[PDB]
């Protein structure tokens with residue numbers, strides 16, 4: 386009915402893609418020809434009425450490096466979220482497949498793709514709030530795109546929303562987030578630096594030998610993730626700059642984009 390509204394009868398379900406915070410995600414066709422991913426929102430997992438109002442704004446967030454929101458199926462339950470389909474799945478799983486034998490130029494291009502999406506979001510004053518390789522997707526061309534931006538606000542699960550919760554993204558959070566719940570564009574910057582570390586580590590867990598509690602203490606004492614073996618000193622300088630103790634001293638995504646482009650030219 387509405388601009389944001391998709392008729393579920395227009396969907397053909399073809400395969401299960403995975404399960405996330407809101408349940409199963411399937412691959413399908415819209416009106417027989419258009420590839421889509423269909424989030425089948427499990428009951429009690431989402432602030433549905435609030436998400437519905439926000440979907441209108443989220444649908445207007447259009448950028449080549451952002452996994453596009455096509456619409457919603459709300460005249461029912463489970464409600465569906467219809468997005469752009471990405472053939473190569475989750476960036477985290479993609480990084481961990483050692484068969485790709487990624488060259489450093491490919492790893493930087495992944496950082497660049499994410500940075501371009503993040504600079505676009507930053508320009509619209511829209512926070513991702515859960516930037517990580519697990520929330521990035523890869524298309525059939527190996528292009529990396531930012532997925533599920535701003536959806537964290539509609540998660541009803543306290544294990545995910547509490548900074549002391551089991552599902553909270555502790556390892557991707559700056560000190561001010563863990564200490565005072567101070568979220569800003571600079572908490573996305575911090576998460577982007579960690580994502581750069583995940584890319585250059587080929588999907589290793591940040592602070593792999595620590596628990597969430599020990600990571601929070603480590604980070605609050607001014608200590609940081611160290612240089613991945615595949616990261617040059619210039620690349621490590623960029624990710625490190627995201628982790629300044631003072632949020633205001635962290636770069637913007639526009640500054641990071643210029644830094645990534647300069648390194649691309651250097652290597």
Ligand SMILES: Cn1cc(-c2nc3nccc(-c4ccc(CNC(=O)c5nc(C(C)(C)C)no5)c(F)c4)c3[nH]2)cn1
Pocket residue numbers: 402403404405406407408409410422424468469470471472473474475515520522532533535536537538540
């Ligand atoms: C083996 N394989 C898979 C593909 C795959 N392609 C895809 N294309 C588009 C989309 C998906 C896709 C996207 C997400 C999820 C699970 N997460 C959520 O739904 C969700 N988390 C959250 C926050 C962060 C806020 C908590 N918000 O939403 C998913 F399981 C699949 C895709 N999968 C290709 N191969």
